[PDB]
Amino acid sequence: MNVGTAHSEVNPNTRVMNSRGIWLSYVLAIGLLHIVLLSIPFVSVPVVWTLTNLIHNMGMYIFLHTVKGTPFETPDQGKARLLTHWEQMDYGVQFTASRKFLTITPIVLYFLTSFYTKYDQIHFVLNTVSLMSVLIPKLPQLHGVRIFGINKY
Amino acid sequence: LVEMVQALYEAPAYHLILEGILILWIIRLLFSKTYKLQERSDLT
Amino acid sequence: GLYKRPFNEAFEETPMLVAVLTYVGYGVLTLFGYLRDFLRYWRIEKCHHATEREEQKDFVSLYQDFENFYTRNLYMRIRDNWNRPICSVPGARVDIMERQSHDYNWSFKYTGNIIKGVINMGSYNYLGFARNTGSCQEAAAKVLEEYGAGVCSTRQEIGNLDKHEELEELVARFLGVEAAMAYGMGFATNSMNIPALVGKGCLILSDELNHASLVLGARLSGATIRIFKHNNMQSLEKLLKDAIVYGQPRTRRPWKKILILVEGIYSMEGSIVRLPEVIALKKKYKAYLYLDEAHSIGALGPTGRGVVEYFGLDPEDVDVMMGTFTKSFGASGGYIGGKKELIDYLRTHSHSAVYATSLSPPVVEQIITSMKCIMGQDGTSLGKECVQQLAENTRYFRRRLKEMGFIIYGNEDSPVVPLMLYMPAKIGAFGREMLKRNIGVVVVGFPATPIIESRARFCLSAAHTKEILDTALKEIDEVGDLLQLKYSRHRL
Amino acid sequence: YGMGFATNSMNIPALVGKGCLILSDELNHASLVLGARLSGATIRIFKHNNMQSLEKLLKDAIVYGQPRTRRPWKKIL
């Protein structure tokens, strides 16, 4: 339906993360991904956890930090065609329960996978470079900055 | 419990350093009560 | 401020399981939409869309593809619920022309058959003034034969007529305010008269659920806009305090003016504004009030003067009283009422007064006859019966729906009943099944509403009889059993 | 008046009160400083014979206004 029929927000996207049951759905999605990975016979538990962390971090990066804009036409005349979803969230307020939860959960997953990976070096470097890739953009200093002009336009 | 402690003891030092700095980061985030607006302006 | 009568409203919360299933559905739709876009881009599947001409292929693309995402992938699938053509007067029963699509709603073809006698729950005729045969129609026909249809000039120029002055004085008597002015479009009323009242350096406080016309009018004027929560007088009071104290953001100076835009009845939410507390706050903090009464001017009130009569308040407290003739009176138009000085200032400085064509004469005749019937100048008892019947139908329908186990929003008095579906597929399913059983309804989706909350709105009328309501209620019960739409914990 | 010290100490309070601003040099006599203190006005000190400092203080005082609640100063002395 048209944007603005039943609410006055120019960008509904900014609030999709504060809705009811979204956090529980996110957690259940991570759990379902983990179970689907466990369903593979030849794969071993430490590399299962490495794959869980890698796939989660890749998808979360793609959605939160790669895709920019709004899927629906918005009546604010294009505030956020250049902004990504993380920048759009909560109209640019840097801290919020949603942002704190979203930036805390990858670290918890990293601790769990470090425990279950038997502290191996190869897995450690993979998981840590992935965690850095996710966590570097979350810094308030890196708001609306494109390194080497990637995804600016 | 005990097995977890032994497994943590078996790990290198840089890994525990990283985990400690990360838990410190989590504490800082969870106690970052300030909510900035991220706006820049000056009078003309 | 205090309420002479109780103020009952209920907004039940979404069960957690339903929220989780909602997000499952939206995720599946998003993934399959991305897949469909990938298929279409590589030309593996032909796209059923119009493309720019070859002469302009090297121009910059006119649209951004990502903006149309929800239109192609989700809106197109259930597009058949909206834009249903009719071929009859939109009374309690309407005739809907039938259409069929063989390419999954991308293109529609009209079959010969026309559905007849559909129970109408989508039109806005609250008092049932939409008749093709009546006294109003005869008066409109006479004025059409005399004055012709439409005027070809502007009010400030030769386009002003005597019928317009007669309508303005009648409206001023109806509302109880000193003076009123009439416009040819309800949307244009706000969009063209909010900029005149308020400009740069003033503050506008808007509800979360304001109509698009009010938001557009606020945007066109240079005033700062701050949004308080829906019917939360704590939020309104806090915003007023901070606005008066801290002043303008860049250079902390006093605001020239503070204007509060609110509505009588919110159509989608179903709620009625807490007018006494708003009036108390505006009196305490010296702020002006703009009251949109499109949905409440005919439906609410013991006699039908609007929200101000419903609560029993004083019309002189409301600074600006907007309104629309489309909903209740059955003819297109709009109006603003208030003090004589305000009305004269608008007569001189309104955009539509200067540049836009004035209203058609048959429409003003229809409005005059309808409004005289409502206030009872003709002496016929049709004035009281319509309002009483609307109130009875509202109470009966709302109570009997709440006792079936559905979730319903809004006050007990408001004649708009939003039932909640909560799931994207159930929107299309409810629309199609209700049409299959000869009931016409209106459904809304995610971009319009909060993501979890998807609803179907019923607009009751004084034309609906007890038999019609009972038939509709039994059909709604059957559908709710079929689609499992009774999420109410308090009632079963 | 019968005393030069008393002149300032007793007549600066009469001219200026709370809500006004007083701009003082770095080298003002003790009588002027005491008279400024006795009145409730805010006191800001610019550098000795530095009209850049005086101009900057005047600009900021007129622009930003009172510290707690940014309102115009009643007077500037």
Active site residue C164: no
Q: Does B16 touch chain A (CB under 8 A)?
A: no
Contact between chain C and chain D (3 or more Cβ pairs less than 8 Å apart): yes
**Mutation for testing the A interface, residue in C24, C446, C454, C487 having most A CBs under 10 Å:** C446
For residue C376 the two structure tokens come to 């009872």
Q: How far away is chain C from the Cα of A18, in angstroms, using its nearest Cα? A: 10
Rounded to whole angstroms, the Cα distance separating C99 from C108 reads 6
CB within 8 Å: C452 and A16: no
CB atoms within 10 A of CB C343: 20
Distances (CA, A) of C298 to C186, C331, C462: 15, 13, 11
Residues in C closer than 8 angstroms to A69, CB to CB, are: 64, 66-67
Q: Maximum CA pair distance of chain A? A: 55
Residues in B closer than 8 angstroms to A92, CB to CB, are: 37-39
D20: amino acid identity, one letter:
C
Q: Does C444 touch chain A (CB under 8 A)?
A: yes
For residue C404 the two structure tokens come to 């079936």
* Among chain C residues, CA nearest to B43: C250
Residues in A closer than 8 angstroms to C208, CB to CB, are: 7-9
Active site residue C332: no
Rounded to whole angstroms, the Cα distance separating C141 from C299 reads 26
C250: amino acid identity, one letter:
R
Residues 6+ apart with CB under 8 A from A62: none
What residue has token string 């106690």? B31
Residue D23: is it exposed, middle or buried by C-beta count within 10 angstroms (0-12/13-18/19+)?
middle
Q: How far away is chain B from the Cα of C258, in angstroms, using its nearest Cα? A: 24
Residue C299: closest CA among C220, C378, C392, C232: C392
Rounded to whole angstroms, the Cα distance separating C187 from C334 reads 8
CB within 8 Å: B35 and A107: no
Residues 6+ apart with CB under 8 A from C289: C259, C260, C262, C278, C279, C282, C317, C318, C319, C320
* Among chain A residues, CA nearest to B4: A115
For residue C409 the two structure tokens come to 């929003």
Residues in B closer than 8 angstroms to C251, CB to CB, are: 43
Angle at C346 between CA C344 and CA C349, to 5 degrees: 115
Cβ-contact C147, C366 below 8 angstroms:
no
DSSP string across chain A: --TTSS---S-GGGGGGGSTTHHHHHHHHHHHHHHHHHT-SS--HHHHHHHHHHHHHHHHHIIIII-BS-SS--TTSSTTSSSBHHHHGGGG-S--HHHHHHHHHHHHHHHHHHHHTTT-HHHHHHHHHHHHHHHTTTSTT-SS--GGG-S--
What residue has token string 């909640």? C420
HSE-CB of A38 using CA atoms within 13 angstroms: 7
Determine the distance from the C-alpha atom of residue C278 to the mean position of all C-alpha atoms in its chain, rounded to a whole number.
21
Rounded to whole angstroms, the Cα distance separating C467 from C182 reads 38
HSE-CB of C146 using CA atoms within 13 angstroms: 10
Cβ-contact D73, D61 below 8 angstroms:
yes
DSSP string across C303-324: SS--HHHHHT--GGG-SEEEE-
Sheet with C416-420, edge to edge strand ranges: C416-420, C455-459, C442-443
For residue C382 the two structure tokens come to 């049709």
Q: Which chains touch D (3 or more CB pairs under 8 A)?
A: C
DSSP string across C385-402: HHHHHHHHHHHHHHHHHH
Sheet with C288-292, edge to edge strand ranges: C179-183, C334-338, C320-323, C288-292, C258-263, C203-206, C224-227
Of the candidates A95, A110, A118, which has its C-beta nearest B32's C-beta?
A95
Taking each helix axis as running N to C, give the angle between helix A97-116 and helix A121-135, from 0 to 180 degrees, rounded to the nearest 10.
170
Cβ-contact C276, C248 below 8 angstroms:
no
Cβ-contact C192, C351 below 8 angstroms:
yes
Active site residue C267: yes
Torsion of CA D63, D67, D72, D76, to 10 degrees: -90
